[PDB]
A paper describes a structure:
We also obtained two cryo-EM 3D reconstitutions of LptB2FGC at resolutions of 3.26 Å and 3.61 Å, respectively. These two structures were assigned as LptB2FGC-I and LptB2FGC-II. Structure alignment of these two structures gives rise to a root mean square deviation (RMSD) of 1.2 Å over 1324 Cα atoms and indicates the main difference between these two cryo-EM structures is in the β-jellyroll structures. These regions appear to perform a rigid body rotation motion toward the outer leaflet of IM, similarly to what we observed for LptB2FG. The TMD and NBD domains of LptB2FGC are similar to those of the LptB2FG structures and represent the resting state. In our LptB2FGC structures, the periplasmic β-jellyroll of LptC was clearly resolved and found to form a trimeric interface: LptC and LptF form the primary LPS transfer path, while a loop from LptG (residues 209–215) binds onto the N-terminal β-jellyroll of LptC (residues 60–69). Intriguingly, in contrast to previously documented LptB2FGC structures, the transmembrane helix of LptC remained unobservable in these maps, indicating its flexibility and a lack of engagement with LptF and LptG at Interface 1. This, in turn, results in an unobstructed entry point for LPS into the TMD cavity. Similar to LptB2FG, we identified four lipids in the transmembrane region of the form I conformation, which likely originate from nanodisc reconstitution. Our cryo-EM structures of P. aeruginosa LptB2FGC revealed a unique heterotrimeric interface between LptC, LptF, and LptG, with species-specific β-jellyroll contacts that likely underlie the failure of P. aeruginosa LptC to complement the E. coli system.
The IM sub-complex comprises the ATP-binding cassette (ABC) transporter LptB2FGC, which extracts LPS from the IM and delivers it to the periplasmic components of the Lpt system. LptB2FGC is a type VI ABC transporter consisting of 5 subunits. The LptB cytoplasmic subunits form the nucleotide-binding domains (NBDs) that capture and hydrolyse ATP. LptF and LptG possess transmembrane helices that create a cavity and a translocation path for LPS, as well as a periplasmic β-jellyroll domain.
Author numbering:
A (entry chain G): 1 to 354
B (entry chain C): 47 to 182
C (entry chain A), D (entry chain B): 2 to 240
E (entry chain F): 1 to 362
Amino acid sequence: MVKLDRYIGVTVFVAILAVLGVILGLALLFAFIDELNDISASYGIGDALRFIFLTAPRRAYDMLPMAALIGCLVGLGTLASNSELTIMRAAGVSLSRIVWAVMKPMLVLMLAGILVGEYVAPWTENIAQSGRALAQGGGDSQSSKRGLWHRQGREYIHINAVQPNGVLYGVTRYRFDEQRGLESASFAKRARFETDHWQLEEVTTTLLHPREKRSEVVKLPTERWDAQLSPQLLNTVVMEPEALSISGLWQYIHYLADQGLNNNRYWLAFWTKVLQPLVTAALVLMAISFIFGPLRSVTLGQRIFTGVLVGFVFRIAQDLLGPSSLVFDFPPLLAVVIPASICALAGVWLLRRA
Amino acid sequence: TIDYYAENAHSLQYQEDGSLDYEMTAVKLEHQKATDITFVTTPDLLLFRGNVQPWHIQSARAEVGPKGKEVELIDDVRVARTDAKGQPSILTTTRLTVFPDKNYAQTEQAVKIDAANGVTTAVGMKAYLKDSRMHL
Amino acid sequence: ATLKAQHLAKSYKGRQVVRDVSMSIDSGQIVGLLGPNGAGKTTCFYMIVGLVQADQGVVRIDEQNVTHLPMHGRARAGIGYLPQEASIFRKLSVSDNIMAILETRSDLDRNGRKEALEGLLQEFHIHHIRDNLGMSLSGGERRRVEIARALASAPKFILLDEPFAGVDPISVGDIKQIIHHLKAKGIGILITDHNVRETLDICETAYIVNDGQLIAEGDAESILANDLVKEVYLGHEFR
Amino acid sequence: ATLKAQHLAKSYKGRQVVRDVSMSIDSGQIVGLLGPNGAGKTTCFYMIVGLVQADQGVVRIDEQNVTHLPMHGRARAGIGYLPQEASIFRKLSVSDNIMAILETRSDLDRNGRKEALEGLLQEFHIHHIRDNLGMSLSGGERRRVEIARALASAPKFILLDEPFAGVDPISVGDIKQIIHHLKAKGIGILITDHNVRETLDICETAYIVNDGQLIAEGDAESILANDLVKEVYLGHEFR
Amino acid sequence: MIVFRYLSREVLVTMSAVSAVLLVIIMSGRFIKYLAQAAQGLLDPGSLFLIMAFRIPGFLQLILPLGLFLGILLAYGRLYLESEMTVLSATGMSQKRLLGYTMAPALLVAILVAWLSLFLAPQGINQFALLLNKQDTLTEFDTLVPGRFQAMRDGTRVTYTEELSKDRGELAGIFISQKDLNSSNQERGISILVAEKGTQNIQADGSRYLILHNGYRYDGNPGQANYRAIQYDTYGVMLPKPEASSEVSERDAVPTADLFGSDNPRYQAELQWRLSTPLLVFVVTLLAVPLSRVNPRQGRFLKLLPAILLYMGYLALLIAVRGQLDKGKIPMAIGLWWVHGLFLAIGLLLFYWEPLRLKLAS
Ligand SMILES: CCCCCCCCCCCCCCCCCC(=O)OC[C@H](COP(=O)(O)OCCN)OC(=O)CCCCCCCCCCCCCCCCC
Ligand SMILES: CCCCCCCCCCCCCCCCCC(=O)OC[C@H](COP(=O)(O)OCCN)OC(=O)CCCCCCCCCCCCCCCCC
């Protein structure tokens, strides 16, 4: 059986591609509208457009399962509403064979999606985030909400922005006394990570002599400070947990568990990233079950509407079950397992119903 | 309400060049929420570098608005010149409308100069803070 | 082979539709199934096909109980099916329309598959259109291609549904010619249709179902003579 | 009253489906409209009804150019209509089903409206089911109620569309009786469907359109004896 | 007069069902964010129910017009597919009569939405704010971890604590740095706070006076000589609630009675916004009738997503115009009504398409 498999696979694949394109376009438009509020004469409209276009791959990867569900629904509905699946069944083919024929392109798409996620989404998402942070953070002592505080010894650091090439922007650090009396307050315009140590550029430190003696100001163009933070950790502590690679999530989870800090959110992100193929398979199975049962001979509009509604309900359930695991101390794996299992069970029931 | 309050504060403020702006000690600092008004009970202002020679102040109470537009010295008012002349030239009146933003010496009432060698009374006070010269 | 449905019976949500209906179709003979729309003619036809499970009764084909088998199980058993509405693979050429089904057959090999496809194309006079897409075919050519596709599975009984519905009088001749051509090969056809005149014209015997129970059966002459049918389905004025 | 359609012509995307087809219905007579499915028969019927705008021609009724009037404008001008599928107000009692239309008639008062509703109910032998909802009625009662409502609109010409579609031979007599009743009332009727036997039996005339042009006309005897229609539409084997 | 009741009942029932579904969806969507905030440490889970109960009317005030839009679409699509409306039109009922028939449920929904948006959303928001101004913030400053930087109120302010007692109080070296996004002059730019121990004092009338055991207060800029060093023993600064008014501006809580006459641009813009919802309901009713004509080929559900998108765009344009008008750029004389005019014109053109084409064909 070669021609029927190709027919079904091509139909579903093209439908999925079109649905994914439309969904990604709508998501990009909504993101642009929502983020248009941040223009401040230092973050131009071109910058926002560049950020959105660079963030597109991450959102496409995130929304791939919904596109798969809706596209499979539409394609199978197009096939069935023309009395073609009935002919195939009456010719000897079986529902298991039809499900396999639909799933094979789904397997290819799942492999492509996992690869794209874990090998591209981090890179482009990081590039976009770094660009936006650099655009918004070339300001003053502490003038960005994309910043990053820190503390070592008795000196409290700040960082306006962090760049992928091991360069910081606007490093302001306060040095105190054992008596908690301030002694200095510096502001370095940039910083670069020489392998041995951090190097500052164009600092403007001001020294406050404790006593009533004269207060002075000094300017060292290339002052050098030895700090504990490292570029690799900095590039990870800022990015959202859901934007890291699978290997990056694994490494950060182990690094956190090493020092005793909790990592439930990172466990949730890792489980949601690694178990996506199972969720996609369950969603496609539920869609196939819908086609053979209730939505047997309904119009295309009803198929699209029901697919969108089911996708919205599933997304809301899985999003509410995410933080709920952290709040209620649920194992993070359940928040991912539950909705997919429910959808697969419902699909299997409706399929057994014939 | 009061947004921030302090007890037995001993604050320092430095000039743009680096010289001391003043050294004020107050019993309590109160900043109401309705306006940026700070009450400094019993201030001890000392313009250490405002005029090189400190201007000792022993005002019983001082009222400060959002800015130093009118830091009025209410109740006991004292101005110990402490300049090259050994005469304190302490002025008491009831209030002294110092102008930190304007930086001028003006009196809200008749000037009562309690000098060392001789005490004199003058009407009004119009004298530059930097100059430090007697002027009605 | 002799398809046999014995004591079929189904009940819908509220009321019974078919009760104690028995049928029998033998290879090489055409059997029509006619009755009032409210009757259980359609439900009996679909239960024989397998679309709707039958509460009671056994549907067996030559001493092989296929009552519990699914639609594809029966299709492998030997039964066929031809839906009334258009059921042609729109984006597949006619040659592909036939070869896609021809692939599923287990016995055939590549050379055998190609030879069978050529024979089927020549048999039904669709050679000239062996490249047109399914969506571009007319009613007559579409029906010929559909019948060729149905035959490509090598069925033992083909259950046509409303063959004459929505066809002008000129095309009913071609439809009847196709049905007789199928009957010549040995297949047995079970026609259900609204057009009683043509169905009785072609079918060799007819089964009439009134309220879930078949009320008459026999040749066309006998069916036209029964008074119960004349009072329930045909009417006195008929013919 | 006479509903005249003159030189009707309609061109779809790039094809001229109908070209210069002229028909005329006179009050008190039944006129049929038959032809092959592909040809311009349904298109002409709709251009007369108002569901498709005519590129050329004038559909005038009693010297009113009603080609441009919308469907409600025609309905107020005298013409009527009756959709092929069931079109009864589902969740509305039959009496309310007719009164919903009776209330619109301007030239009536409350007592007059009640008397007219009673006359309509007793004239179509649907009085006993006067309280049933629209969902309960079966085929015959549903058709009778729909006809009673259409009449309650008080039309001049009633354009039936496929009245003999999927009806048992026994029930066709009731529809023929209803059509004869309407004709006796003095209402010109236009009928179109694929039942070339019942339509020719009931109809007083028939217009056959093939390839978008009128190819024949006249009573059933002339139509059947005609040769062009036989070769293109009816087929030699017919009759 | 029977078709009037029939259509009104159909439209009202469908609108009620769609409104219930939309309300459930929206409430779950916002509960997602609230639960995320609670899991992050802020907020108190016990107060979520009250927050949602007091915020429901604000959701309804915007859901109801969309509910009516979709209900009209679904009901009239059903009546078109089942041939009832074809028979209605083939008997005399024009489309202006149909609009008149459908303008009764629209009027009832407009009355309901006006009541909501003018006398229940303000009171609901006021109660929400009053019951949110509670121990929630007192919990947040108790959420401090001995090694975490809680950047309260975006990037303006931060908070730190080397060591915090489990029972609260007797904190270790505390560091609090606040920056003002305004001009800030020079000294007001950055102001840090360091106290050796620090403590929290519950106000007799206020929320909490964080009492610092001993420390300093520093003001100025990192690259400037002037620095106001304040040395104290006890220092007290209240802790504002992170969500006291962040998600609810005071413009919403003011009763509609006070909005009249006030020359404050924000108040007048809010008053114009409050009156826009009934007009929106009537406009959606006007432009939902012609769009409800669907043949069986394209079904009944095809044009629901585009309708939702159109309604969302309408609301977004209204809100953007309201903001740019309350910020002073758009003159108040033109106001917010030109958006209503634009959508009324588009709906009117959509409604008169068939008559215009028929007149075009002589
Ligand atoms: C930095 C990168 C930024 C990328 C930004 C991307 C923005 C996307 C916005 C798209 C908005 C418009 C969507 C247009 C597509 C839908 C239109 C439609 O109905 O198309 C139907 C068409 C039918 O296919 P046809 O060629 O007719 O073949 C039929 C086979 N019998 O269907 C088709 O097959 C044609 C449509 C194909 C659409 C392909 C695009 C969808 C997936 C895009 C993923 C992009 C990111 C993925 C990762 C990239 C990593 C580098
Ligand atoms: C089948 C579906 C049918 C329905 C289609 C949808 C039609 C809806 C039409 C209405 C669209 C609503 C758009 C809402 C925009 C909201 C903008 C906003 O909130 O930002 C306001 C922003 C403030 O800027 P400001 O502060 O003045 O700048 C100085 C900075 N201190 O202001 C600005 O900076 C303004 C700059 C705007 C630049 C263009 C932005 C793109 C807008 C695209 C909207 C969608 C268009 C889709 C059309 C499809 C038609 C078929």
